[model samples]
Target: HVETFAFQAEIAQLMSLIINTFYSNKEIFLRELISNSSDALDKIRYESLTDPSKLDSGKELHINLIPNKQDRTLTIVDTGIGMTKADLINNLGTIAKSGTKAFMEALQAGADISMIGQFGVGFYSAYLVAEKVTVITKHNDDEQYAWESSAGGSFTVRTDTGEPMGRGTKVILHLKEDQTEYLEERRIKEIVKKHSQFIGYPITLFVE
Candidate 1:
């Protein structure tokens, strides 16, 4: 079953602009997403140490990329903290933070650049290439949900009707023609070294 969630008009415009302009390199999209995945794995690992039950499943902390040249698709998958429906809309649809006004106030006050990712909009970078993007996720506290968007000012989220992951998420990118460089093994490896070599998790590439 599918459902629709709408962001405030102003927030939608802000998201569109940021996704289109903020980051200089499209390859950083892979780096940003992988970095977020690494953070998620770290959170779960730390939590699991105290609550051993948290290790019951989904404890694998690895990143996987699958390239399909025939269909021009690239899938990035991770076993991390998946989002709930509210999180899908809040995280993907709107800014959902204290407020841009407050953020700007902090910026003017010389806040650190590192504070940006804490706002939770990091995943939206996937829009830089995919004409359509699909996020399939299973959260530790909620039912599995899938969020899809064409980045055309709207998006939809739905109860995932397929098999659920033990935990984690998979983002399938239907790559735009110009963004196909991500499908190359050497290119992806180079990117990993440049941006993700210091990341504390294992990253693998799958080709067929």
Candidate 2:
């Protein structure tokens, strides 16, 4: 069953602000997405501490960048902690619904935090260069699902029955016509060099 959900009023406003005014360096969208992947890996590793079964047997913790010229899409795949349908709704369906002010207060109180809490809107950065975004994710404990959106009125979620994705998330960005630079291997290499050189996980690129 495909489920459709509308973005919260503030979430829609935040998306517009992010695409138009948040960051002048549009390339940082790549950085934000990669960082979000890293955060997922961190969470899975932490969870595996209590429940050893969270680790999907032989899967390695890594990210792969696959650019498709013909499709005008760039996919960032990470073998990390994937999300459940509820997580999709809570994580991507809304942004800071709990209010950032209270979150800031928690930060002031020295509470434990994740990067998403500090920059909760990082995933929306995909709209900076992409006309649409599709996320395929599989959580160890939940069935696989695909979430897609055009940063418009609403987003959709449904069961994914493609090849088994194991345990991870795949974010596919359909680049805008004017944002073709991101599809180049050389350009991607430079972005990774400048922004992700020291990231803990290995991020591989598909060339040729």
Candidate 3:
């Protein structure tokens, strides 16, 4: 089931701030996304203990990278618990618990700069290097769906008619002109190895 959803004005403004504040460290997006996926993996695993049919009972637990230089896109696909439209709405739109106030306070207080998503703006970090971010996910209860955004305020949702993800999420990043450096296999591997090697799941790269 796919439909269109719009974010409030604050969502767009907050994403803009995240992009502007951390564009120089765009590599961190990979780490944050991987961390989110890892969290999802843990969730589904716990659920599967009670429900046997959840994502093949947690058989596949890995992350895949598909880079299409011709299209100038970088895709991060994860086999983890998927999300619903409402979950996307709250997670992506809310910005959570006094978004900028807490964030700015942390910055001024010299808090550990590494903790980017403590207040829930972690996902928007994708905009640092991508002009557009598309999320395709298949949740068991919610069906397969897609979410698209440009960090400009609102997002669009549609039903996914393509091959099913079974249970997981796929994030396609349409790289910005200057951020196209991530559209290479070699560079992506280097970034992953450096920032995400500690991830609990396998991170494989698909080239072509």
Candidate 4:
């Protein structure tokens, strides 16, 4: 069964505001997402120091980028600490007055845009270029789940029974017509070099 949840009234407004305000530098969406993946990898590594079973996937920790020209999608995949259904709701849906809401206020107050990743609202930057976003993720303790949204007033989370990804998260972005430049390998490589060159783990791009 799929569960639907509404973005709090202010968050819905915040979504629209950030998307339009951050339009000029859409490349930062890729940077913000890759930063998130790096953080997830760090979490899994720290946890595995206590319980080795958390690393049962036996796959090296890394990030993968797959750009499908035919499908007009850019997927950022990572082998890291995945999230539970509740995590998806809390992280992607709701925000406390001190968390994402505060970030929105900062944006309105003309805070530095480079601080986007620090506010924990970086995920929303995906909407700067994507018309829709899909997150497929699996955690060691919970069933796999797919979370999707169109930056509308609401989002849906459903348990997925499709091919398992072992463990980690795959963030799929359905590109907007004008944002198709993100699907080009040359452009992605340049963006990675500009912003994500310092990430500790390897980020592989599927060329085929």
Candidate 5:
């Protein structure tokens, strides 16, 4: 069963503050998300050097951006370090901690752009464009799991029954009806080139 959990009592408001106050523009959300994906792949790359088996079939760093026109889904698939169920809760569960209040306040009050990944809330920036974010991931130590949130006060996670990612995270962004600019392939390519052109990993845009 997928148990639904609420964000922290007072901290929930901060989640809203973070969601609205963080992004200077809508396009920046994609940049931050892709950068976060790159960070994940980089982490696993170093980890696998310590234990080669950590990577199945010795996968390399790669990212795939698949936009489903019919379903209005933009899925970003990466061959990187995936999160466990507990991880999904713990990492994204910062909304349940009051300490995050400081993080939110600092971010709202003109924080440096380079410090985003360190905070992990960069993933939450997806809320700027997506109505819901679905994460399908598989790790070396656990089966695949699906985590979803509607940018509301709560989210639900469950076991994924779809194809496995081997060892990575796939974040599917269901773009809001009004956010149609993200649906354009050319737009995404331009944004990717503009923001992630310098990333270490290969960022691929899937045409299908």
Candidate 6:
């Protein structure tokens, strides 16, 4: 069983605003998710080269999109290094280790803000469009698990019910009502070309 923690008040408020209002462009959602997928593919490729048996040989480095118009849902899947339960919590919740205390210290020292991205806040981007998001992931070292959240106060993680793939992760976005334009093929393709055309791996769009 995993424990939960609350975000610092300021950070939580900031998150709520960003997730609900600031990002007026819904198209950027595809860009952000794809960028993240590219990063994961790059990590797996590097690992595969250094350790031949690091990942399944049959697994290809790629990103896939499956859009379900009926449910107003879009799913992005990738063959990349998947995270564990602890990773899900740390990556999605809480601020950097240099937390309130460290941030205060940095301010007192007048340090630069360049290192803030080192914190794992990227996953929160999913909350921008999804009222509810489900992550089904399988890792090389851990059993498959599903992490679900609404970007509220907390998230839940449990063993996945479906058959596990050999490697990688899948993010199923239950998109909000106003964000349905992303379900279109043309829109997804344009977003991919704009932000991820140069990525090393192939990205496929699967539509109904």
Best-performing candidate as measured by TM-score: 4
* Candidate 6, residue 89: how far the Cα is off, in Å: 2.0
Misplaced by over 4 Å in model 4 are 91-97, 112-114
lDDT by residue for model 2 over 63-135, one digit each (tens)?
9999999999999999889999888987644446654334445545664223323546568778889999999
Please, what is the whole-model Cα lDDT of each candidate in the order they appear?
Answer: 0.74, 0.81, 0.78, 0.86, 0.76, 0.70
The per-prediction CA RMSD against the true structure, in angstroms, equals 3.6, 4.8, 2.5, 1.7, 2.8, 4.8
What is candidate 6's lDDT per residue for 41-83, written digit by digit as tens? 7887888888868676346889899999998889999988877
Pairs of residues at least 3 apart in sequence or in different chains that clash in candidate 3: none
Worst 10 residues of 6 by lDDT: 112-121
Give every collision pair in model 1.
Answer: none
TM-score of each: 0.82, 0.86, 0.88, 0.93, 0.86, 0.80
Query: Residue 85 in model 1: shift from native, Å?
Result: 2.2
* Model 1 stretches with alpha carbons more than 4 Å out: 18-24, 91-120
TM-score of 1: 0.82
184 Cα displacement, candidate 1 (Å) = 1.0
* Cα lDDT for residue 73, candidate 5: 87
Candidate 4 lDDT by residue in tens digits, 111-145: 85566777876877888889999999999899999
What does candidate 2 score on TM? 0.86
lDDT of 3: 0.78
